[PDB]
Every structure is written in C-alpha cells, then in structure tokens.
C-alpha cells in the first residue's frame, strides 16, 4: 500500500484463493483454465447479458499453488486485457521498523 507500484510483497498470510481483477468480457473460465493448471476451481462472474464483471475467483489445493500462480499469472495479458491477481482474504499490515536490532 503505497503512492507506487512495488511489486510481489510477502504479506503475513496465507490464501488459496486469488482474487482476479480486470477480466475481459472474451475472457471465460475456460480461458482460465488454461493460465491455471494447477487451479482446483475457477469462478467468473458475469452479468445477465453475459460480461464478466471484471474480476474472478481462482481456487487452490493451499497457499502453496496458490502462490505459484499467483507469482507469475500476476498481470498476465488476456485477450488484450492485463490481469491482476491478489490473495483474497483480510487486509494485512507490514511491521513497523524505526532501528534494526
């Protein structure tokens, strides 16, 4: 969380779940389930003419696969579109560090 883009952070949590934003409408779970292999179940939702709403929810075997893709599939482009990919789940917070001991 900052005014700029860092890139992969270790965040204190784990999450098999990754959430996707910035889905293109050509886009479908089938597409999907060719960017995420190891992906257990994939969700996306559309609209009632049949746009995906611009996001989806990926499902994992743990924190473990999770991560994998997670790691590279961040901002892959489909159908033109970058995706994103960030661990659902609770807003964690970094550990404040004024002086190494």
């Known amino acids: 969380g900052s005014s700029g883009s860092s890139g992969n952070?270790?965040?204190s949590g784990e999450s098999k779940t990754l959430v996707l934003s910035n889905l293109s409408y050509s886009a479908?779970?089938?597409t999907l389930q060719e960017v995420f292999e190891k992906a257990t179940f994939i969700k996306v939702p559309q609209n009632q003419n049949g746009?995906?709403?611009g996001y989806a929810f990926i499902e994992f075997a743990s924190f473990e696969d999770a991560k994998e893709a997670l790691n590279s599939c961040n901002k892959r482009e489909i159908e033109g579109r970058a995706i994103r990919l960030e661990l659902q789940g609770p807003r964690g917070s970094p550990n404040?560090?004024?002086?190494?001991?």
Do not use: D, Q
């Open 51 to 53: 746009k995906s709403k």
């Open 28 to 30: 479908t779970e089938e």
């Open 96 to 101: 404040s560090g004024p002086s190494s001991g």
């Open 9 to 11: 952070s270790t965040w």
